């Protein structure tokens, strides 16, 4: 007895994912800075936590 046709729910999901994907990319795009970044991420020490997600 599946059912997915209610525009009340369609209004909710469409409003979130438009704001969801642009969440970290608009707010942090315009912000006064507060601290100093790292700016050094060496060999064998930089992005391997992404590889941890791959396995």
């Amino acid at each position: 007895n599946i059912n997915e046709n209610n525009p009340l729910l369609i209004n909710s999901i469409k409003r979130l994912l438009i704001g969801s994907l642009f969440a970290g990319y608009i707010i942090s795009n315009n912000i006064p800075p507060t601290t100093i970044p790292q700016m050094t991420m060496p060999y064998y020490l930089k992005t391997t936590a992404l590889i941890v997600t791959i396995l």
């Binding site: 007895n1 599946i2 059912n3 997915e4 046709n5 369609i10 469409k14 050094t40 992005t47």
Partner: protein, 57 residues
């Protein structure tokens, strides 16, 4: 009770309304439009690096 918009089934794969699938299709693309700014233009480390900082002499 009141409405028969979506039919009951007995595992015959009751079909969809064929209008939700358009909006399903659209937001599978604009999320992969956002594969543009993943590399273009954005790198893993726009910093520069150190030459194993030896030359103290």
């Amino acid at each position: 009770g009141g409405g028969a918009h979506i039919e009951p089934r007995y595992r015959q794969f009751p079909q969809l309304t064929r209008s939700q699938v358009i909006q399903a299709e659209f937001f599978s693309a604009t999320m992969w439009f956002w594969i543009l700014w993943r590399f273009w233009h954005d790198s893993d480390a726009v910093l520069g690096h150190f030459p194993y900082p030896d030359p103290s002499q």
